[model samples]
Target: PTIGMIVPPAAGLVPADGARLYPDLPFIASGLGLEGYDAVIESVVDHARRLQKQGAAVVSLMGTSLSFYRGAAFNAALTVAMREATGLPCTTMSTAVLNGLRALGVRRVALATAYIDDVNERLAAFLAEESLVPTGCRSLGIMARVDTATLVDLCVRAFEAAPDSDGILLSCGGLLTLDAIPEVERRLGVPVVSSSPAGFWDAVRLAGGGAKARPGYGRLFDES
Candidate 1:
C-alpha cells in the first residue's frame, strides 16, 4: 500500500521531499492558483479520488495555505471531504503541523512561510485555534519556485526573530524543508517542524504503517 498525495502545482518540491522519506509514495498534482482557494480545494478532492483509484492507502492534501487560508475548521472540513470522497484516511499539511506541534510539546512558535502578508495572518489565527502562539512570523514573499538554500536561510532568520519561542515551523508545502530541519534546529537550539515531512509522517501512520523516527527529521516523528 502506498501513500497518496494531492499536491498543488506551486509546491513542486514535495514529490522530491516525499521521495526522501518514502520513495514509493504516489503523487497526484493539481493546478496552482494565486487567489484560487475554492478551486484549489476542488482540485484536492478530485485528485484524492484519482490517487485512491491508483491504490493509495491514505491520502494527504499537501497545500498548507490552500487548506488553511480560511481557518482550522475549514482545513478540517477539507480533510473530512477528502476521506468521504476517497473512502480512505485523509490528512493535510495544516493538520499535520498541529499534530507536530503537540507531539513536540511546543506552545509558542515562530513561523517561516512563503506566503503573502494576508496568508500569514490567517496562519497565525489558525495556530491560535490550537492554543499555540506565534511569537514571530517571517515571510519570504515567495509564492512560486524557490531553491532549498534560500528557505534554509530564511528559516534561520525566522528562528532568530523569535529566539525565545519553544520551537519553529517552516510552513509551506512549496518549500523543501526536510533538508533544512536539522540545521535549523541546531542553530536555533530548539526543535523544528516543516510541512512536507509532518504531512508524510501523519499519512503513513494513518495508513497503518509503523512510525519510524529517523535522524534529521526532528522529534515529531519519534512521538507515538
Candidate 2:
C-alpha cells in the first residue's frame, strides 16, 4: 500500500530516507513549508487529499516541530483535520514520538532536540500534556547532530543529566538514527526512540502493517 507523508520542506530527507529504509513501502511525498502557503492547515489538508486521490492507504505529517510547535491540543487538532479531510488513517511525527515512548514503557523521558530553548520548552510542555514528562533535555539549535559519537554523546549526556529517566527520546525528525540507537540503548540500558524511525513505524502500522523496519534499527521496529 502507498503511504502519504506531508513534510515541511526542512525535513525533506524523509521521503528519501523512507525509501532507503523500506523500499517495498510506497509513498506519496509532499513538502509544504508554512512560508510557502497562505494557510498551513489548508495546505496540509489539501496535500492529504491529493495523496488520497493518488491511492495512498494512510497519511502522515512528517515535520516534528511543525506538528508540535503549538503544543498538544494543536497537534491533535491537525491530526483530526488531516483524517477528516482525507478520510484516511492519519498521524504526525509528534504523535509517533509519543507513541514510541509509550510502547517502550517509557514514563520519564530524556530529550535531545534539534531546536533552541523556546522550542524545547514548548516540546516539554507538549510532552507533559500527553502524560509523559521530560526528566531533562538538551538542544542542538539547528541540526540533527547525526555524527555517530556525537549523536550517542548527546543522548548519553541527556540520560546522565537526568538518570531518573526510563528512556531516551531523540526528538528531531532529521536525524540519521540507524547507527545511534543500539549503542545508546546499550550504554544507557534503556530504549531509544527517535523521530524518523518512529514516524515511519507509525505510518506502517496505520496501514495495517505491524511494527516493522529493516533489521537492527532498534527495539521499537524489531518488535510489536
Candidate 3:
C-alpha cells in the first residue's frame, strides 16, 4: 500500500532529491503543481481522495509550513475531510507534530527553525494559541527552501539556543532531522520532535503498528 505524503517544491528543499530523502514512501506534490490559493486548498482535499483511491493506507500533509500558514483548525479540517472522503486515517505534519509534543507531556517548549521571520513569528503565535508556552524560539533566517539542508548546522545550533525547557521543536520538514533526533534527545535529555518523525509516528500508529520508542527521537515514540 502506498502512503500519500505531500511535499514542497524542489526549490523548497535542501535535498532536491525528494523521493530519495523518503525512499521508503511514495510522495505526491500537492502544492507544487497548483497555481493559486484555491488550487492548493482544493488540492489538499482532492489529493487525500486521490491517494486513497490509489490504495494509500494513510495520508499525511508533510510539512510544518503548511500547518504554520494554514493553522491547526485548517489542517485538522483537511485531515477530517480526508478521512470522511477516503475512510482512511489522515493527519497533517503540524497536528501530528503537536501530538508528538503532547505525547511527551511537554508544557514549555523551545523552538528552533530554519525559516524567515514571518514564518517564525506565525509559528510562535500558533504555539501560543495552542496554550503551549513558546518559551523560546529562534530562527536561522533561511528563505531558500531548496537549500534547506545546508542549514542543518543552524538547526543543531537552534537546538542549543533553546532554553532549558521541557522539549525542543526542530521545525522545517526539509532538515534531514530524524538522523539527528537521537543525539538531540541525549544531549537535551528531552523530546526533540521534528515535522517528519511526528507525522510518521502518528501514521504508523494509525496504520495499526508501533515503533518501539528507542534511544533516539525522544521519549514520545515509546508506547508506554
Candidate 4:
C-alpha cells in the first residue's frame, strides 16, 4: 500500500498490518514526511508511483495521518493522483474508515485518535465534511508510534466515557485494537469500528465488488 507506511529504512519504525495480512500482498512505503507545518507531497507521489511499478494492484494508505490529518482535499487529490499513476484503486486508512461508515449508514460517531492539537483539529474538520460528527473524540496528543501504544487504555477509556453515540471510530492504524472491540461493544451495546477493521473490510469490498456485514469487525461486520 502506498499509504504513508514507514519501511524499516530509518530502523525501528515498521509498517502496520502490511506484514501480517498474509500471502502475496506486499507493502510499499509511501514516503510521507511531516516536518515544519507541511507535508512533502512530492515524496508521497514518488514513493507511491514506485510501488505501483512493483505490481501493486491496490495501494492502501497504511496509516491515518496522510488520510485524516492531511485534510480532505489533499487526501482525495493524492489518492486520485496515485490511482491514476498506478492504474489502481488507492485508499487511505481514513478513507477506508469513511467507506466502512458509509456502508453501514452510520452518521453520528465517536472518534478517538492519536494526533496532536493541530492535526486532530484538521481531522475533525475533515470528518465534518463527511457529515460524521465528532460526538466523542480524543487525541493522545502524541506523534510517535511507539508512544501511541500507551494510548490504548486511553482509547478504551474514551469509549467508556463516550455518550450514547451510534458507533465508535478508533483512528490511527498503528494502534491496533481489534482485540478490544468485542469487549467495548459488549459494554457499550453499540458498534465499534477500528481503523484496521475498517481498512480490512474495505479491501475485501474492493476485491469482492460488494459489501456485506461480515462478522469479526463489529455489528456492522455482521451479515445478518
Candidate 5:
C-alpha cells in the first residue's frame, strides 16, 4: 500500500527520510503551503484528490502545525474532508502525534516544536481533546530555521523541564527528526514522538502496514 502525503511547501524531507527508514514503504507526496486554515482548506482537498488519483491508498496531511493550528475540531474536520475528497482513509500529523503518544502509553508529555507561543498554546489545547497532557513545552520561537542537532538540544531541554512526564513530543513536521530519534531517546531515556516520523508511521498503519521503525528511529517502531 502506498501512503500519500500532503505536506508543506518544502516537503522533500518526510518522503526522503521515511523512505530511507522504512525501505519497503512507498510514498506519493505533493506540497501545499504552511498557510493558515482557511488558506489551505480548499487546496488540501484538491491535493488529496490528486494524490488518490495517483495511486495513494491512504492520505495524510503532513504539517503538524498546519493541522493543529485551527485546533482539534478543525483538525478532525480536515481529516474528514480529505477522506471525503478521495474516498481514502485520511489523517493529519496532529492525529499522528496523538496516536503515537497513545501507542507509547504516554499520558503527560513534554513538547518541542518549531512554533511560536501561539501555536504551542493551540497544541496544548489539541492534546487535551485526546486526554494527553502537556507538562512542559518549548519551541524554536519563530517557525523558521533550526537544524536537527539544535532540535535534539531543544527536545532534551523540553523533557528535562518535565522529567516526570511520560514522553517527548517533537511537534514540528519540518524538524526532520527520523535520524535524531535515537539520539534524543538515548539522552532522555524515554520514548520520543516527533511529527514527521509519526506522520509516516500513522500513514503506514492506516494502509494496514506494520508501523515498524528501522533501527535508528527508536522504541515506537521497535516494540510494535
Candidate 6:
C-alpha cells in the first residue's frame, strides 16, 4: 500500500512536491546523498533495499541527475538492480520522465535542469535513446536549493529558446518544479513535466495504487 522513494539529500523539496498530489497517500522515503557526487549512484542499491525492508510495494530512485548520469543503458541497469534487490517493481526518475513524455505525446522537448554542462549532456543523450528529441536545454549550474522563481525563469527561457519544441521537461528532483508547473505550462501553451511527479506517478502505478485525476499538477496526473 506504499510507494517507497529513494532521494538525494540535495532534493530537499522533492517530498513536499509529491505530497501535494495525494496528501493522504503513503509515501515512504529514504535520503541517500550524504557523501558526495560518488555517493549518489554508489548508494542506490543499499537505499533501495532499505525501502524494500520497509515493506514498500514499489520502489523508485527519485534523483533525476543521479539516475541519468551514466546514460540510458546504465539507468536500465540500475532499475534492474533495484528490482533484483527488492523483488518488486522498480523505476527511477529518468525512466519516469520517458513515460511522462510518451503519455503527453511529446516529440521534441525543451529541457531545464539544475546541473552542470556535463550532466546535461548525458541527459540529452539518454533522452535521445528513448526517442525524445531535445530541441534545447538550459542548466542552472546548481545541484540543489534552487528557488521557485529561478526554476520557473529557466523553464521559460528554455521554452522560448526552443519554441518549436512540443513540451517542456524540467529535469531535476531537487527543483521545486511542482509549484512552477502551472505557470510554465500556461506561458508555453505546452505540457510541462517534472521529475518528482513523474517518478511518483510511475511508482504509484507500479505499486498498484489508485491514481485519481488531480488538477494543478499537469496533464500527466490530470489525464491519469
Best by lDDT: 5
Q: After superposition, how far is residue 170 of candidate 5 from its true place, in Å?
A: 1.1
Q: What is the lDDT of candidate 4?
A: 0.59
Across 92-211, the per-residue lDDT of candidate 1 in tens digits comes to 888888888888988998888765566557878999986899888788774546777777787777778878889887776354677677777766778888877888777777777564
In order, candidate lDDTs are 0.74, 0.78, 0.63, 0.59, 0.79, 0.78
Say which prediction, candidate 1 or candidate 6, comes out ahead on lDDT: 6
lDDT string for model 2 (1-224, tens) is 78888888844335555765676777777777553233878888988887789798898988766777777888889889989998989899889888888988999998876556666677678889999978878876664335777778878887899999989888653546668888988887899988877888888887885535777778887646
lDDT of 4 at 100: 73
Q: What global local distance difference test value does model 5 have?
A: 0.79
lDDT (10s digit) by residue, model 6, range 1-224: 88888887844234775667777677888888552435555588888888889888888888756777677888898789778877988898888888888889898988887666665577778999888898888887854567777878988888888899999888763547787888888777899888778887777777774665357777788655
Candidate number of the best TM-score: 2
Clashes of each: 0, 0, 3, 5, 0, 0
Candidate 4 lDDT by residue in tens digits, 59-116: 6665555567657777788778767776777777678778877666667777766555
- TM-score to native of every candidate shown: 0.83, 0.90, 0.76, 0.73, 0.87, 0.86
**How does residue 124 of candidate 6 score in lDDT?**
78
Which runs in model 6 stand beyond 4 Å of their true positions?
10-14, 34-42, 143-147, 173-175
lDDT of 5 at 148: 74
Cα lDDT of model 3 by residue, 19-125, tens digit: 32334444443443432546666667776676677677887777655666766567667678768877887887777767878888877777776666566677777
Winner on lDDT (1 vs 2): 2
- RMSD list, candidates in order: 3.2, 2.6, 4.4, 4.7, 2.7, 3.1
lDDT of 1 at 49: 88
Ranking by TM-score: 2, 5, 6, 1, 3, 4
Off by over 4 Å in 4: 1-39, 114-119, 140-162, 173-176, 209-217
